[PDB]
Amino acid sequence: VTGNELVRRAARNLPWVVTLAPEGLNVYDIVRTERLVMDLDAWEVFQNRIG
Amino acid sequence: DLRPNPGANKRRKRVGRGPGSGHGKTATRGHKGQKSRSGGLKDPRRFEGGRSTTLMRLPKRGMQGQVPGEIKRPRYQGVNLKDLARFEGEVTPELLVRAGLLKKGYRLKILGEGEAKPLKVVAHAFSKSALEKLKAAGGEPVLLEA
Amino acid sequence: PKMKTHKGAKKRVKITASGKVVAMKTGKRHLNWQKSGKEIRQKGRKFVLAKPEAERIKLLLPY
Amino acid sequence: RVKMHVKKGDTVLVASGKYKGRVGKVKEVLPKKYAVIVEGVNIVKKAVRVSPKYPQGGFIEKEAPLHASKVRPICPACGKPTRVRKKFLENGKKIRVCAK
RNA sequence: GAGCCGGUAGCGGGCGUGGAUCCCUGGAUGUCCGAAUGGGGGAACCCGGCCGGCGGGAACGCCGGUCACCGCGCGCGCGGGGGGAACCUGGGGAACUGAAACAUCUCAGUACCCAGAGGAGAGGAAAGAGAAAUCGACUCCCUGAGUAGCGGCGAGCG
RNA sequence: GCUGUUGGGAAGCAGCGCCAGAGAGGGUGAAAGCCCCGUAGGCGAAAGGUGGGGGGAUAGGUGAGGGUACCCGAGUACCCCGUGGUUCGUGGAGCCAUGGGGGAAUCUGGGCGGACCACCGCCUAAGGCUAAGUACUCCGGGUGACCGAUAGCGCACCAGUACCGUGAGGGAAAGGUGAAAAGAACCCCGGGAGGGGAGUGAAAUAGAGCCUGAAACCGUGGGCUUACAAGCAGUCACGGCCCCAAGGGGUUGUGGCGUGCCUAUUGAAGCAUGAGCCGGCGACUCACGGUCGUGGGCGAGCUUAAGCCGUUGAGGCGGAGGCGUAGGGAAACCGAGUCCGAACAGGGCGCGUCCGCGGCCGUGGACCCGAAACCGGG
RNA sequence: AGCUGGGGCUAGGAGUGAAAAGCUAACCGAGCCCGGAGAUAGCUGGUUCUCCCCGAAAUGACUUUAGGGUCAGCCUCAGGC
RNA sequence: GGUGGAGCCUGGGAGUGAGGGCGCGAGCGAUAACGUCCGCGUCCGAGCGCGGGAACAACCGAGACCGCCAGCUAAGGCCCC
RNA sequence: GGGAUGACCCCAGGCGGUAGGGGAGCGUUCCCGAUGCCGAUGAAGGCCGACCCGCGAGGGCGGCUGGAGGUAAGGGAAGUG
RNA sequence: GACCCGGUGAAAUUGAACUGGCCGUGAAGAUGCGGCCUACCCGUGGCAGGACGAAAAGACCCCGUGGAGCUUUACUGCAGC
Numbered sequence A: 001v002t003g004n005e006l007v008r009r010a011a012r013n014l015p016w017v018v019t020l021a022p023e024g025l026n027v028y029d030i031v032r033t034e035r036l037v038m039d040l041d042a043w044e045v046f047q048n049r050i051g
Numbered sequence B: 001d002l003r004p005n006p007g008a009n010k011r012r013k014r015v016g017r018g019p020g021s022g023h024g025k026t027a028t029r030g031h032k033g034q035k036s037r038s039g040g041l042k043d044p045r046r047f048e049g050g051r052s053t054t055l056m057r058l059p060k061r062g063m064q065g066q067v068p069g070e071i072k073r074p075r076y077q078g079v080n081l082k083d084l085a086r087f088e089g090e091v092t093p094e095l096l097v098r099a100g101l102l103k104k105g106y107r108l109k110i111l112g113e114g115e116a117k118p119l120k121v122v123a124h125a126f127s128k129s130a131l132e133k134l135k136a137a138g139g140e141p142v143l144l145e146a
Numbered sequence C: 001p002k003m004k005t006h007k008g009a010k011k012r013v014k015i016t017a018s019g020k021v022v023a024m025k026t027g028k029r030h031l032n033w034q035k036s037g038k039e040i041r042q043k044g045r046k047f048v049l050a051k052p053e054a055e056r057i058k059l060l061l062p063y
Numbered sequence D: 001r002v003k004m005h006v007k008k009g010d011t012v013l014v015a016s017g018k019y020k021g022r023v024g025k026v027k028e029v030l031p032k033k034y035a036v037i038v039e040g041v042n043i044v045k046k047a048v049r050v051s052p053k054y055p056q057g058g059f060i061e062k063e064a065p066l067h068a069s070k071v072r073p074i075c076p077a078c079g080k081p082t083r084v085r086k087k088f089l090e091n092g093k094k095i096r097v098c099a100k
Numbered sequence E: 001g002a003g004c005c006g007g008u009a010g011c012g013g014g015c016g017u018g019g020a021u022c023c024c025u026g027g028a029u030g031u032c033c034g035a036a037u038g039g040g041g042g043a044a045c046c047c048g049g050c051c052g053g054c055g056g057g058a059a060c061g062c063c064g065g066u067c068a069c070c071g072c073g074c075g076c077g078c079g080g081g082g083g084g085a086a087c088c089u090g091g092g093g094a095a096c097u098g099a100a101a102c103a104u105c106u107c108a109g110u111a112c113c114c115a116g117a118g119g120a121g122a123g124g125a126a127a128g129a130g131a132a133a134u135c136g137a138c139u140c141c142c143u144g145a146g147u148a149g150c151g152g153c154g155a156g157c158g
Numbered sequence F: 001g002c003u004g005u006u007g008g009g010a011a012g013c014a015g016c017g018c019c020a021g022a023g024a025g026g027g028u029g030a031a032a033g034c035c036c037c038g039u040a041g042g043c044g045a046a047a048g049g050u051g052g053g054g055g056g057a058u059a060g061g062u063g064a065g066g067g068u069a070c071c072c073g074a075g076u077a078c079c080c081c082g083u084g085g086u087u088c089g090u091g092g093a094g095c096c097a098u099g100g101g102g103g104a105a106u107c108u109g110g111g112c113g114g115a116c117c118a119c120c121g122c123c124u125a126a127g128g129c130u131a132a133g134u135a136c137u138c139c140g141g142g143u144g145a146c147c148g149a150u151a152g153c154g155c156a157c158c159a160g161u162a163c164c165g166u167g168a169g170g171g172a173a174a175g176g177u178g179a180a181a182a183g184a185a186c187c188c189c190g191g192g193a194g195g196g197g198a199g200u201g202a203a204a205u206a207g208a209g210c211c212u213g214a215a216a217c218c219g220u221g222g223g224c225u226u227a228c229a230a231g232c233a234g235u236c237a238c239g240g241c242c243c244c245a246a247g248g249g250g251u252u253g254u255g256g257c258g259u260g261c262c263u264a265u266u267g268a269a270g271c272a273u274g275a276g277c278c279g280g281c282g283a284c285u286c287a288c289g290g291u292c293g294u295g296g297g298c299g300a301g302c303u304u305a306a307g308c309c310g311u312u313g314a315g316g317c318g319g320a321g322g323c324g325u326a327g328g329g330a331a332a333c334c335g336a337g338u339c340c341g342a343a344c345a346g347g348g349c350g351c352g353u354c355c356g357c358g359g360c361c362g363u364g365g366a367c368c369c370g371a372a373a374c375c376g377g378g
Numbered sequence G: 001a002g003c004u005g006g007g008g009c010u011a012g013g014a015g016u017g018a019a020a021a022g023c024u025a026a027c028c029g030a031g032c033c034c035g036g037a038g039a040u041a042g043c044u045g046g047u048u049c050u051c052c053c054c055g056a057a058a059u060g061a062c063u064u065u066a067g068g069g070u071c072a073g074c075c076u077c078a079g080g081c
Numbered sequence H: 001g002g003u004g005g006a007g008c009c010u011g012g013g014a015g016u017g018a019g020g021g022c023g024c025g026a027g028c029g030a031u032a033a034c035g036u037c038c039g040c041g042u043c044c045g046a047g048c049g050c051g052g053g054a055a056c057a058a059c060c061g062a063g064a065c066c067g068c069c070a071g072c073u074a075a076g077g078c079c080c081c
Numbered sequence I: 001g002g003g004a005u006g007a008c009c010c011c012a013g014g015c016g017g018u019a020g021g022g023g024a025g026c027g028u029u030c031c032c033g034a035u036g037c038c039g040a041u042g043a044a045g046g047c048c049g050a051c052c053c054g055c056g057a058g059g060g061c062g063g064c065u066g067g068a069g070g071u072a073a074g075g076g077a078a079g080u081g
Numbered sequence J: 001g002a003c004c005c006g007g008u009g010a011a012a013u014u015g016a017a018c019u020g021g022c023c024g025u026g027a028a029g030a031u032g033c034g035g036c037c038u039a040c041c042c043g044u045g046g047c048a049g050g051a052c053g054a055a056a057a058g059a060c061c062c063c064g065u066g067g068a069g070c071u072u073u074a075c076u077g078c079a080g081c
């Protein structure tokens, strides 16, 4: 989950990365993978998005 | 967690019960069985028997609407002054329906029972016991006539 | 679609708060009936029973 | 259109089958069935003719189409897919790098 | 950019790295019928007139133009005519159904017919709405709302 | 992205790699990111359509004042009769249209604010145009908890065809050899078709309207069994005999016992109905509301809709609104009360949503089949 | 009052009829085809896997109602008592 | 007294409203009908699944979870079948 | 009720069933799980099975036939028997 | 024509049938139930008594709050006048 599209591009295309926008976080794409790696400028939008 | 078993916790009841059967809803298409339940019945809330089924009642509910319709009249929502007492400040409409009660229609008639907080309510109608309740603790102004 | 409320049942039936259904007793109705004698007094306001289960399913949305 | 493919009438390796690795000559492209013929599949045609002429001696009968997604072209290299180099006026087929 | 000559398989017959086969764009030719339109017609056919062309010839021929009808302006000229799966507006417009019969009603201004029109149509700038010393074209979507109402105050419609 | 491997065939398996803004998919003799076509990304229009999205000009627009009452769309407004439209079915019937009749004025005009009238407002009819957003899908593209040849269109195929109909119209069925036609040269029988060899191929009971090819059905061979037997055809019991050798299955000789299936029924073996058999197709769903339940979330709060912004099979923003917080009453209204009443007797009535899921109901065609018919257009 | 070939007219509540309600494209007390239309059917048929638990009614009232339906009776499920 | 797929209440889902035989009490009929209409049952309905009744829904015995090549019995039988 | 939970362990009853009500399940198609795991050292399918597990629906395993797809546990939506 | 032989060779119908008779019995008219009595298995040509044979979801009757046609001093319309 990165707000840097020039690493979303890098990880777009692997058998083990689901690339994702920082706004398009969703529980199905969380759960279908076993790890989660997110930016600080994706954790900030997630933390202010939820309560 | 993973896509194996987040699954719904044992209560969906979704045998969305198909009566294709021979055991289950055994072939007369559970509940059915005679005829005139064969693709329709008429209401049966207003309806039949064919007698009146209840038209033997009678419209006391008068002033039932000349043809332009209901006069677009004021309607005062009624809050208790105990459910007004959940907050603090100069309680007004928009310390109302901006938060909570009164559902936006027309202005306010507080009333009712409960602990009248000392706070000056600018309501727009009052019950006599609400006035006597919060003059015993606090104050109030009255409606807008601007 | 959007289950239509029976306007007749609105016009002659009132749904209470706790769930009963109240209407005029029948026979006072301008009489067509008879002369006086306290039956027109006792035509006040009854409440029907087990007909609400077939009657509150008409009046739904505006109570 | 879609029907254009790897190469044309030159020498070419086949990496297919029984002939997994065989450098055949000029290949005589099919290509609506997307094959060539080149030098590989040499299966016997048990046929007389349509016109009854010069009858059956032996059968040294001719080749078969050989579907053209397995004819790896050649240069001073082995295999190495074709590429396009244009040089401002042309469109030449240069392999994964040797030349030509 | 090397194979082609359509769905080729066969005569073998040619044609292409001086650029083909293809694909796109723009022309040309578009026989005859069709709005059919020179007249007729039983569509894909007959029979013409005028001008211009080939003893190929004056008579029958054939070629290439032009010859319908209506609407608009000054004999003269620009459009229209028919088609289109639905979509839309207008003119007409049912009945079975539902009301547990049925006539008012509903189905429904639905289907269908006709006209028109176009990529949309419609409507549209207030002699509006109706409670606000208010909103400010029209259309569409969601709310309003199954509300207000209408209703053999039934069915239901709204 | 090469090698080795079993293989007909490798991309499968294994080793050693590499690309990735390309690990979407297809085909490749099967299971391919690295063979092909592609995809990510990025170029490309001479010619035509296209297009203020971007800037350019044109056409047009710039009796503020105070007056002499000039002009503000005519058989029109208004009135009546007749109707349609709007929620409006004659109703208290306005309004908007207008078929009939009477019939005006141009701003101290005229209409409207739901009979009407008077105040207060609102707005200028009887002339026209006016993009945008919206409906649509013959068309082109992609997308599918869409179908996979009786499905999906009626047509995957030479189908709106054959065939039926005078006609309007109806209207079918019918896909798959294999990797490649290598689609069987040559014999032999036969007139040929068809075979049997040979050959192909991994496979030819893959051999040509050919993959798999079930069942009904029809044969052939074998085992058991029947020609003094009786039965809804079985079942239980023993016994006999070939298969496996413990125990089994196959047969059925005798005995015992046994009135088929479904539907409709007060009752059916029923001499009531349907069913020749087999294979397929075939009938409780869905949209929006409602009523109860249950799993959840939040909880006197709950809660989005259309739309907006963004994607890759990312979702957020949007509180207009809807329910719910107070009810009584016809209503004004009053309020933990309200109403009936003269009554401070009496009595009537007096406190959650949003999803998911299920039962059920409403309007939907609403479980599927079937009418006689009715009407419109031909 | 003939028959018949050709050319033509008249068509659906309409034609036509020396009349029978006959004929109108092989079935006419209102043709056929398409469309409304998946009309409607209180009627007949049919309803497709398995197991387990509990298990009725054919009665009353009312019905333009008597083969249908509404409510109660009998039934089941869940909750509370 | 009665712990029983007893009850009472609320809510959801019904089905059913063509019943029938037998017994008893009657009506109608003829002190007829496997007749018809009720009341109290019962049973079939749905228990004919079983035993007896020769066969046979409702007569008599009895309420079938499944098995067993065990037993005691009900109505009914005991010469054979 | 026993339970030193592991609610498996016993106990008293019940267990015909139509319309029905209620509860468990098995299957088919599709999807998530899946860029995964199986599969030519033979997929789906077909024919068998006297075996195995399940009360059953069915599921496994084995044998041929087939010659290329299948898709786990848990779930979801049905054009579901 | 039928019948035999050679050739081509349909059909409606059909639950499966391994399909006897009589007395009973059973939804009241039995090959199928009980009891008895006959009766080797299979045809061919026949006759038609039965299989409530076939055919037509009775064409008479009744029910449908079906549908039409028609009538009229039924009701209400419309044409016409």
Ligand SMILES: [Mg+2]
Binding pocket: A010, A011, A012, A013, A014, A015, A017
């Ligand atoms: Mg990646």
Ligand SMILES: [Mg+2]
Binding pocket: B018, B019, B020, B021, G048
């Ligand atoms: Mg089913």
Ligand SMILES: [Mg+2]
Binding pocket: B033, B034, B035
């Ligand atoms: Mg019935």
Ligand SMILES: [Mg+2]
Binding pocket: B034, B035
């Ligand atoms: Mg019945």
Ligand SMILES: [Mg+2]
Binding pocket: B050, B051
């Ligand atoms: Mg009545």
Ligand SMILES: [Mg+2]
Binding pocket: none
């Ligand atoms: Mg509301």
Ligand SMILES: [Mg+2]
Binding pocket: none
């Ligand atoms: Mg060039």
Ligand SMILES: [Mg+2]
Binding pocket: E008
């Ligand atoms: Mg050619």
Ligand SMILES: [Mg+2]
Binding pocket: none
């Ligand atoms: Mg060129």
Ligand SMILES: [Mg+2]
Binding pocket: E020
């Ligand atoms: Mg050329």
Ligand SMILES: [Mg+2]
Binding pocket: E022
């Ligand atoms: Mg060309």
Ligand SMILES: [Mg+2]
Binding pocket: none
């Ligand atoms: Mg020319």
Ligand SMILES: [Mg+2]
Binding pocket: E036
């Ligand atoms: Mg012409």
Ligand SMILES: [Mg+2]
Binding pocket: none
């Ligand atoms: Mg003409």
Ligand SMILES: [Mg+2]
Binding pocket: E045, E046
């Ligand atoms: Mg001609």
Ligand SMILES: [Mg+2]
Binding pocket: none
């Ligand atoms: Mg000359």
